[PDB]
């Protein structure tokens, strides 16, 4: 019981971070 939309955004945001770094 997490939020699919928020989680996918969370993951999307984390991938940008990893890619920038």
């Amino acid at each position, epitope marked *: *019981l997490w939020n*699919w*939309f928020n989680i*996918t*955004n969370w*993951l*999307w945001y984390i*991938k940008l971070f990893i890619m920038i770094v």
Partner: antibody, heavy 131, light 109 residues
Framework: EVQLVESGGGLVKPGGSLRLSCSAS????????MTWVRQPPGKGLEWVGR??????????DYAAPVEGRFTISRLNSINFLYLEMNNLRMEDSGLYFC??????????????????????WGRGTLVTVSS | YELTQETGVSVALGRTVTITCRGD??????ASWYQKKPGQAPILLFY???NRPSGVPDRFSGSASGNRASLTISGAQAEDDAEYYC????????????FGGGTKLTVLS
């Protein structure tokens, strides 16, 4: 052992309402996302709408042709999905399916909110909107 | 109408054929693919990057690049004659889903 059975199709006058029902068994329904899909005879499939799970707060989305006229709902103790259509049109005529809907997101290549897909289907129930 | 598919495609028995699905959202999102025969329920064939569900023969595989998703059938059988629908997001970031117009796959007789 997954069984999806839609019900409630019939002749309706083109200003009227109709409630459709989708019975579910053979999977964890309470947490499953469910989508409604329609097909006019001799024509394509059209996405109607989708109800999410707990943790999405059962948020519901609708294709633009049905916003405000159609309402998706559910009751989880008996595993029944529902579709209330009001102010029907001849465009709304078709074979309506309920589909068990998985969610997909590939961390590395994906983009929010990923995509949804229809893993199980019922045989549908026939809706004829003609005056 | 954001997903475009060939209206018809034919294939000789035993040969290989590929159907396309096309939209701007396909630059961001994968498509799922569905077989549909008259009087029968759609069958999920393939979805996301590499996912074939249990029960679907290996001759079916999807791919993607650019604004295109392709379902390829390798070793076409009589029973593959059907309509095929792609599905994805109508637009990038959308919570809605849309179907393509459908492709009539004819296994030539």
């Amino acid at each position: 052992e997954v069984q999806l059975v839609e019900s409630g199709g019939g002749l309706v006058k083109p200003g009227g309402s109709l409630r459709l029902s989708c019975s579910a068994s053979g999977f964890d329904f309470d947490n499953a996302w469910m989508t409604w899909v329609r097909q006019p005879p001799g024509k394509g499939l059209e996405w109607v709408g989708r109800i999410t799970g707990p943790g999405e707060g059962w948020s519901v989305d609708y294709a633009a042709p049905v916003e405000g006229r159609f309402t998706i709902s559910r009751l989880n103790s008996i595993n029944f999905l529902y579709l209330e259509m009001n102010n029907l049109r001849m465009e709304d005529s078709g074979l309506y399916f309920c589909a068990r809907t998985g969610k997909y997101y590939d961390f590395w290549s994906g983009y929010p909110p990923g995509e949804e897909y229809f893993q199980d289907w019922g045989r549908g129930t026939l809706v004829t909107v003609s005056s | 109408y954001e997903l475009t598919q060939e209206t018809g495609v034919s294939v000789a028995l035993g040969r290989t054929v590929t159907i396309t699905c096309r939209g701007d959202s396909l630059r961001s999102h994968y498509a799922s693919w569905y077989q549909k025969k008259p009087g029968q329920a759609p069958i999920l064939l393939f979805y996301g990057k590499n996912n074939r569900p249990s029960g679907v023969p290996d001759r079916f595989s999807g791919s993607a690049s650019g604004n295109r998703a392709s379902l390829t059938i390798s070793g076409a059988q009589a029973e593959d004659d059907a309509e095929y629908y792609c599905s994805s997001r109508d637009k990038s970031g959308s919570r809605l889903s849309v179907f393509g117009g459908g492709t009539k796959l004819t296994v030539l007789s």
